[PDB]
């Protein structure tokens, strides 16, 4: 297959050809709308290893954000831009459920992303039970509760002693440990 011949190539993000294509596509995406749709990705392997399957109901929106911090300037916006993008399209395309995202391109002023979306009222997705979990109602707007990759990263959620403050919900364990617990028969 071509999976690795693309993967090992797109890691080479500073070769002449890829910086040429980057100079092309960034201008294209600047002139298009901020949020928009391309009916086929620019990075198909990298889609296909997030949960994409090219069938009826899987959707790709492409998206744009400013670069820089939260100006109120030196406040640093704990939402990742990846997550920010996901919020934006999950608002616009409401019915759709976000599945994951990724990076295609960048610029000094902007960062251009792509997003994977699913239409779980579509019947292929209701069937085809590798993907009949998203139609369960808990996954409404995954992005804004942070259950995508970057959301979990910036919640701080991986295993460790480094992630001991934030492992099981930061506010949950705060409420666990900044809490007095009294029994009936004291101790």
């Amino acid at each position: 297959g071509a999976y690795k011949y693309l993967e090992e190539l797109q890691r080479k993000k500073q070769s002449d050809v890829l910086r040429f294509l980057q100079r092309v596509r960034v201008w294209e995406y600047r002139q298009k709308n901020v949020i928009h749709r391309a009916a086929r990705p620019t990075r198909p392997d990298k889609a296909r290893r997030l949960g994409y399957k090219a069938k009826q109901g899987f959707v790709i929106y492409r998206v744009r954000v400013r670069r820089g911090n939260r100006k109120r300037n030196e406040l640093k916006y704990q939402r990742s831009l990846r997550a920010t993008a996901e919020e934006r399209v999950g608002r616009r395309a409401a019915n759709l459920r976000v599945l994951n995202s990724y990076w295609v391109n960048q610029d000094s002023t902007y960062k251009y992303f792509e997003v994977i979306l699913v239409d779980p009222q579509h019947k292929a997705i209701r069937r085809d039970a590798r993907y009949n979990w998203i139609c369960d109602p808990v996954h409404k707007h995954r992005e804004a509760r942070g259950l995508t990759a970057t959301g979990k990263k910036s919640r701080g959620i991986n295993k460790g002693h480094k992630f001991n403050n934030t492992k099981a919900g930061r506010r949950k364990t705060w409420k666990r440990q900044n809490t007095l617990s009294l029994w009936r028969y004291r101790k």
Partner: protein
């Protein structure tokens, strides 16, 4: 194996080992006979980044320790700068 006491260069209790099966999730980089060819192919296609040009150009004229330092400055570490600059030396050798 240990000594048989609590403290020593191999301390602790001594018992019969079993040497269990070497698990598949340690052999991650033992790469392939495919992906070597792949990685080489993409290298020759996509070429060489500018700092990789400057690196080998430094190795031509002004030695390789400065190149090691420069890799350690572009990237963070030393244990990756060593491998990258040695790989670049290997490529310069293979050019002839």
């Amino acid at each position: 194996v240990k000594t048989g006491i609590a403290i020593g260069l191999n301390k602790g209790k001594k018992v019969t080992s079993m040497t269990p099966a070497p698990k598949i999730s340690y052999k991650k980089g033992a790469a392939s006979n495919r992906t070597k060819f792949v990685r080489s192919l993409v290298r020759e296609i996509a070429g060489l980044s500018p700092y990789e040009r400057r690196l080998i150009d430094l190795i031509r004229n002004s030695g390789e320790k400065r190149a090691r330092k420069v890799a350690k400055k572009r990237l963070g570490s030393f244990t990756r700068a060593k491998a990258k600059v040695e790989e670049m030396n290997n490529i310069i050798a293979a050019s002839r």
